[PDB]
Design a protein around this ligand. Structure first.
Ligand SMILES: CCCCCCCCCCCCCCCCCC(=O)OC[C@H](COP(=O)([O-])OCC(O)COP(=O)([O-])OC[C@@H](COC(=O)CCCCCCCCCCCCCCCCC)OC(=O)CCCCCCCCCCCCCCCCC)OC(=O)CCCCCCCCCCCCCCCCC
Ligand SMILES: CCCCCCCCCCCCCCCCCC(=O)OC[C@H](COP(=O)([O-])OCC(O)COP(=O)([O-])OC[C@@H](COC(=O)CCCCCCCCCCCCCCCCC)OC(=O)CCCCCCCCCCCCCCCCC)OC(=O)CCCCCCCCCCCCCCCCC
Ligand SMILES: CCCCCCCCCCCCCCCCCC(=O)OC[C@H](COP(=O)([O-])OCC(O)COP(=O)([O-])OC[C@@H](COC(=O)CCCCCCCCCCCCCCCCC)OC(=O)CCCCCCCCCCCCCCCCC)OC(=O)CCCCCCCCCCCCCCCCC
Ligand SMILES: CCCCCCCCCCCCCCCC(=O)OC[C@H](COP(=O)([O-])OCC[N+](C)(C)C)OC(=O)CCCCCCCCCCCCCCC
Ligand SMILES: CCCCCCCCCCCCCCCC(=O)OC[C@H](COP(=O)(O)OCCN)OC(=O)CCCCCCCCCCCCCCC
Ligand SMILES: CCCCCCCCCCCCCCCC(=O)OC[C@H](COP(=O)(O)OCCN)OC(=O)CCCCCCCCCCCCCCC
Ligand SMILES: CCCCCCCCCCCCCCCC(=O)OC[C@H](COP(=O)(O)OCCN)OC(=O)CCCCCCCCCCCCCCC
Ligand code: HEM
Ligand code: HEM
Ligand SMILES: COc1c(O)c(C)c(C/C=C(\C)CC/C=C(\C)CC/C=C(\C)CC/C=C(/C)CC/C=C(\C)CCC=C(C)C)c(O)c1OC
Ligand code: FES
Lengths: 54, 51, 66, 57, 126, 93, 385, 53, 126
């Protein structure tokens, strides 16, 4: 019984610690506004032969 | 003002339940291992007055 | 034993002996097992690790749908 | 008898920690699912899941 | 911190006079009984701060048979305060048993220390 | 403080080094000493003898690596000097 | 009992500064290390006074540095002092390590000191890279991108971890904000590690240059050695002043003074002077995983130098071959940095690869065989029969 | 992850300034620690223009 | 760290062979001469470090006179190196008097330490 109480404490503490670590780490991950997908258009008809367009 | 209420309340409910359970468990364990000293006794038997 | 007892010396790098390692082999083996078990426990948000965890346990963890 | 349970689970710390972690994992998942379900059905028509169906016609 | 020489002077002055005694001793006993240490097992020869050097010398001067009793009283008090109960109303300290045995061992040492600390700042004498 | 582990050096009075006897250290005090008793003889002579006694130990490695670096450099600029088709392609490519 | 040993707040300073039985034969290198610590503290102070007037955006980070260098009363002194104090800090850091290698300090008594020191080294390299990213010049941005992409070598977790640390698909506001916050934080952790280094040191004191027991006679720090640290720090202060006033841009490169532009790259991408040795070995071995692992191998080898040397006689003052090999090692290090700074061409690749081989070999195999030769020669020469 | 310089290298294509990845005119690694060729993004041509996203 | 058992074995093997001895004795003599420690006033029986506990046992076995002489030599060496000078060419340690006085007190204890580290890991035998 005593060890089962200690184990319940350990299990709940582990769940809580995992959740807190998840919160703290995912606070540093990519934000929402940094998720802008970029579409670009290039005038190929204006590109000369011996030139690189970037 | 805070387009984050739904998940805030859900998370709060989860945290409250987890913490209340852990509080009760901790109360129990403190009552447990502290009992090793709370129930002790002392029987003072004075020594023989020799010096 | 008259007279020499024919002692033999076990292999050892100072302190650890072959006997101790033989005794501890399953212990460390499933200690590594438990360590990786806890590692799976700790990680849950990685889409790669979540994707890996979804298939191996399909009767307990079918939680991906919106 | 509980002697078997003790000598298979709580005699050895390695298995004890393994079981505590596995139980933590399964508990976390099932607990999250249950709490989300309860918080959901507790508000019928207050969550966008049914509003998106109601608006559709 | 406040030496027991001044306390002794004020106490003698208050107690010697009849009218102030009659007006002040009735409330002192009620004050002590309402204080609290009496029931929990403390004698007033123990509750004082016992860390400053002059009290340290006084403690060093105590005979064995009182130091041991003081040790028992303080440890039992620690225990009972730990368990949040109170002692049963049979092993308390009676009204007539709160006798000060540690007071003279403080007054003598305090007088010696005070009248030695002054002796250095002596004058040419005349 | 809690007792700590065994140590080969202590504090003053319990250094713990081997016990010595017969050593008799002297002194002169700094005020009545005229600090720079030797300031040019000691300087020049000791500096030159010490430079002599530990000269090779830096001359040899530095010279070795300087020769190496010079050879590498000279080959490098020989590569990019009217030799990019005959010498470059036989090692680079 | 004297008040110098009663008050705890002052008892500590007594035990570490006022009275500590340093050995008699100490040369100027221990003072070199103390000067190193004082350089750290002046760097921290001027860094705080720097940050009180520094922005933290990415469109408003270069403007902040030009503002602090041009349009603030008595400001450019601060910025050049921070930069050149860092460069001198790395100079003295390498000097302190070289002394440690040479005189046998890394041996058995202070393995913990050696470990804490190499931890401080990797921390310091991280701090310098972070700060060098804080400027967001032209080449600094490329360096940040390269190092934050180094971790992509790890299998399986190669794109998740970078996407976490980088905080985005490209170097942008979160990246620089994160880098600046870390650059501010980590020097305090360095200070904590310095405290740990001191505690692990004082347990057994310093070592004699002769490699002999110092438990015979000793003399206190203050009124003898405090003046030695004072003179060596006066020398450092004057040389640093010479750099920070007369010739400011000699311990660096003229590319940080360029607005960030993820469109073009300089002709040659080079780190600052104190990283070229740990950059040549990257071009050395042409496997990405091999390079990423071999950097940390180049540090772990310093970790494993203890219980590798097996000469019973400490130090290299009395081992001609060992000290000659040490000097060829130090010239190897400088040659490695130089060969890194120059471009990758036909002879240079062979130069660098041979340099890496002889460098790691000196750490691994040269030291033990040379040590055994030394021990056996000493044993046989002095004995007759 | 550092831009190769155009019209430079050992194969007339691209050269990594960081540690020398010689990308041919096709765009494949020849010499250098780079283990993969340079990945080609998705695109859809539309007449005299093109869109990439 | 490297025991003197292996060193002694290698040394005896080298010295026993006559041709290899004729090859290696002159280079050993010239090496120890250029070693740069005879002049400053050191016997090689002191340069060995004093961190291993076996070294502590070795020193604790020394007689009084040798320990005192070793202390004098080491402190004098400390001072002379502090001065940056070398000793005068009258007390340079002569080659013929570089006797080994401490090697036996290392080997006698090293053998005991080795057999202690071995005998613990014994087997049941037959
Ligand atoms: C998870 C939640 C667990 C329940 C927590 C509550 C609790 O412990 O209450 C017990 C507590 C008294 O138990 P205790 O004082 O811990 O132990 C009494 C004996 O030692 C009796 O205990 P024992 O040492 O004989 O224990 C052996 C037995 C065997 O049980 C185990 O060891 C379980 C092992 C499970 C393995 C899987 O365990 C129990 O009796 C379980 C107690 C629950 O009950 C109360 O008095 C409060 C709750 C009941 C009144 C509620 C009023 C509202
Ligand atoms: C400068 C570039 C090199 C600097 C390296 C770092 C030197 C250092 O850390 O300080 C050691 C510093 C003192 O040495 P220490 O550790 O006290 O004694 C050990 C001696 O080396 C024991 O050997 P020694 O003394 O036989 O030979 C060394 C000799 C070497 O000294 C020389 O003569 C230098 C030329 C030979 C050496 C060349 C560089 C090596 O040192 C001296 O002569 C002693 C200092 C003489 C200057 C005394 C000044 C008295 C106060 C004047 C007040 C004037 C007030 C004006 C208004 C304000 O050595 C110097 O003399 C270097 C600083 C002087 C540079 C003058 C320009
Ligand atoms: C660019 C960034 C620069 C950053 C610089 C930061 C400050 C650097 C301070 C250098 C320093 O503390 O020098 C120590 C100091 C070393 O002399 P010490 O304090 O007597 O220590 C003995 C040595 O370990 C050596 O023992 P020894 O008595 O065999 O001395 C032989 C001497 C060889 O030098 C000579 O024979 C003197 C002639 C040199 C000209 O070797 C040196 O110490 C030369 C190093 C300096 C040149 O520098 C000197 O050489 C003093 C001047 C004589
Ligand atoms: C980057 C990741 C960082 C964060 C990394 C994770 C941090 C958060 C971890 C939470 C999960 C672990 C905490 C609970 C530990 C636990 O439940 O331990 C169970 C047993 C209890 O049993 P016991 O006290 O050892 O006695 C019984 C001995 N038997 C009979 C088992 C042989 O005890 C043991 O087996 C020994 C105890 C193991 C844990 C010691 C305490 C740790 C506290 C850490 C607090 C700060 C964090
Ligand atoms: C407190 C609130 C901040 C933490 C938080 O925010 O944790 C949020 C979590 C649940 O939210 P979540 O993780 O499911 O959100 C997931 C998606 N972001 O709460 C809890 O687990 C409460 C438990 C707290 C920890 C209790 C045990 C403490 C051990 C500490 C060991 C280190
Ligand atoms: C601008 C160019 C400068 C070039 C010179 C740089 C400085 C070098 C000085 C070297 C002095 C000569 C060597 C010692 C000669 C000597 O000892 O001569 C005698 C004196 C010092 O004798 P002493 O007390 O040291 O004897 C100590 C033992 N009893 O010497 C000087 O007082 C020279 C003063 C002029 C300089
Ligand atoms: C004093 C240090 C000068 C640093 C410097 O000068 O850094 C620049 C030089 C580059 O030489 P460079 O001709 O390419 O400079 C051309 C641009 N003007 O780096 C070096 O030499 C590094 C050599 C030593 C590196 C490791 C040192 C470790 C000790
Ligand atoms: C913040 C950086 C550091 C500080 C402040 C510092 C501080 C000190 C101090 C005060 C000493 C005593 C004498 C001296 O000043 O040199 C010392 C000695 C020493 N330090 Fe450090 N140190 C630092 C970095 C390192 C590093 C990185 C290493 C090794 C990787 C190291 C290894 C040593 C060693 C071996 C000694 C030996 C002293 C002896 O043998 O006599 N230190 N350090
Ligand atoms: C902890 C307090 C510190 C602060 C507040 C601080 C702040 C700064 C700032 C603002 C810059 C310039 C930012 C930029 O140019 O955009 C900088 C640069 C730098 N810092 Fe720090 N710093 C601190 C500590 C350190 C330490 C301890 C070191 C290394 C020992 C260090 C090394 C550098 C280096 C090398 C640069 C070079 C880049 C440039 O020249 O600006 N800093 N620091
Ligand atoms: C592209 O050309 C190059 C180039 O090729 C190379 C090699 C380099 C050289 C660069 C390097 C060698 C990079 C080295 C840099 C690092 C290793 C830094 C990496 C960053 C970190 C390690 C972050 C550290 C931050 C922390 C907060 C550490 C965490 C702290 C902990 C865990 C302690 C917690 C505290 C307590 C009390 C427990 C260049 O700079 C460069 O550009 C010119
Ligand atoms: S970045 Fe391409 S080889 Fe260096």
């Amino acid at each position: 019984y005593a060890y089962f109480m200690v184990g319940a404490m350990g299990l709940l503490s582990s769940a809580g610690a995992k959740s807190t670590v998840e919160t703290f780490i995912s606070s540093m991950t990519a934000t929402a506004d940094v998720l802008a997908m970029a579409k670009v258009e290039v005038n190929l008809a204006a590109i000369p032969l011996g030139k690189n367009v970037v | 003002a805070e387009p984050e209420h739904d998940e805030r309340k859900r998370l709060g409910l989860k945290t409250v339940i987890i913490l209340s359970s852990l509080y009760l468990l901790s109360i129990w364990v403190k009552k447990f291992k502290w009992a090793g000293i709370k129930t002790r006794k002392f029987v003072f038997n004075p020594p023989k007055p020799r010096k | 034993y008259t007279s020499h007892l024919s002692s033999k010396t076990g292999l050892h790098f100072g302190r650890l002996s072959l006997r101790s390692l033989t005794a501890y082999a399953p212990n460390l083996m499933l200690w590594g097992g438990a360590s990786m078990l806890g590692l799976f426990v700790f990680t849950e948000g990685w889409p790669k690790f979540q994707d890996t965890l979804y298939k191996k346990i399909p009767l307990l963890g079918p939680t991906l749908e919106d | 008898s509980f002697s078997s349970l003790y000598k298979t689970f709580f005699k050895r710390n390695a298995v004890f920690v393994g079981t505590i972690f596995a139980g933590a994992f399964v508990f976390q998942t099932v607990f999250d699912t249950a709490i989300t379900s309860w918080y959901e059905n507790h508000n019928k028509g207050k969550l966008w899941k049914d509003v998106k169906a109601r608006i559709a016609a | 911190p406040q030496s027991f020489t001044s306390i002794a002077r004020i106490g003698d002055y208050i107690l010697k006079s009849p009218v102030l005694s009659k007006l002040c001793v009735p409330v002192a006993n009620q004050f002590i009984n309402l204080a609290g240490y009496k029931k929990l097992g403390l004698k007033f020869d123990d509750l004082i701060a016992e860390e400053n050097p002059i009290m340290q010398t006084a403690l060093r001067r105590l005979p064995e048979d009182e130091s041991y009793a003081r040790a028992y009283r303080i440890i039992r008090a620690h225990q009972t305060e730990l368990t949040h109960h109170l002692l049963p109303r049979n092993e308390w300290i009676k009204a007539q048993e709160d006798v000060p045995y540690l007071l003279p061992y403080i007054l003598e040492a305090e007088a010696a220390a005070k009248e030695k600390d002054e002796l250095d700042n002596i004058e040419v004498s005349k | 403080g809690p007792p700590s582990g065994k140590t080969y050096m202590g504090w003053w009075g319990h250094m713990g080094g081997p016990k010595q006897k017969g050593i008799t250290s002297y002194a002169v005090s700094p005020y009545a000493q005229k600090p720079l008793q030797g300031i040019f003889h000691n300087a020049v002579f000791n500096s030159f003898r010490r430079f002599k006694s530990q000269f090779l130990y830096v001359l040899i490695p530095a010279g070795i690596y300087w020769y190496w670096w010079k050879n590498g450099n000279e080959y490098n600029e020989f590569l990019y000097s009217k030799a990019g088709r005959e010498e470059l392609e036989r090692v680079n490519v | 009992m004297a008040f110098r040993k009663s008050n705890v707040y002052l008892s500590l300073v007594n035990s570490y500064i006022i009275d500590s039985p340093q050995p008699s034969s100490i040369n100027y290198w221990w003072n070199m290390g103390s000067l190193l610590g004082l350089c750290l503290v002046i760097q921290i102070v001027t860094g705080i006074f720097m940050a009180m007037h520094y922005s933290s955006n990415i469109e408003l980070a270069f403007s902040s540095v030009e503002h602090i260098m041009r349009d603030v009363h008595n400001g450019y002194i601060l910025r050049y002092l921070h930069a050149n104090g860092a460069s001198f800090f790395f100079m003295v850091m390498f000097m302190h390590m070289a002394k440690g290698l040479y005189y046998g300090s890394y041996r058995s008594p202070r393995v913990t000191l050696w470990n804490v020191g190499v931890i401080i080294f990797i921390l310091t390299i991280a701090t310098a890279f972070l700060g060098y990213c804080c400027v967001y010049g032209q080449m600094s941005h490329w360096g940040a991108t390269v190092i934050t992409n180094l971790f992509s070598a790890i299998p399986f977790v190669g794109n998740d971890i970078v996407s976490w640390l980088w905080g985005g698909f490209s170097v942008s506001n979160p990246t620089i904000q994160r880098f600046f916050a870390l650059h501010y934080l980590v020097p305090f952790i360095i200070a904590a590690m310095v405290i740990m280094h001191l505690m692990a040191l004082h347990i057994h004191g310093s070592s004699n240059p002769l490699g002999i027991t110092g438990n015979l006679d000793r003399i206190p720090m203050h009124s003898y050695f405090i003046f030695k640290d004072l003179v060596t720090v006066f020398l450092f202060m004057l040389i640093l002043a010479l750099f920070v006033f007369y010739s400011p841009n000699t311990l660096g490169h003229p590319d940080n003074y360029i607005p960030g532009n993820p469109l073009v790259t300089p002709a040659s991408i080079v780190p600052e002077w104190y990283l070229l040795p740990f950059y040549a070995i990257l071009r050395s071995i042409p496997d990405k995983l091999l390079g990423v692992i071999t950097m940390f191998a180049a540090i772990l080898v310093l970790l494993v130098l203890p219980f590798t040397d097996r000469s019973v006689v400490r130090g290299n003052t009395f081992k001609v071959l060992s000290k000659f090999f040490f000097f060829i090692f130090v010239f190897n290090f400088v040659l490695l940095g130089q060969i890194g700074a120059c471009h990758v061409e036909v002879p240079y690749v062979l130069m660098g690869q041979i340099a890496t081989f002889i460098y790691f070999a000196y750490f691994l195999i040269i030291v033990p065989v040379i040590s055994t030769i030394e021990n056996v020669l000493f044993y046989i020469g002095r004995v007759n029969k | 992850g550092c831009v190769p310089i155009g019209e430079a290298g050992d194969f007339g294509g691209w050269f990594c300034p960081c540690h020398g990845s010689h990308y041919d005119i096709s765009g494949r690694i020849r010499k250098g620690p780079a283990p993969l060729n340079l990945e080609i993004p998705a695109y859809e041509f539309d007449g005299d223009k093109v869109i990439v996203g």
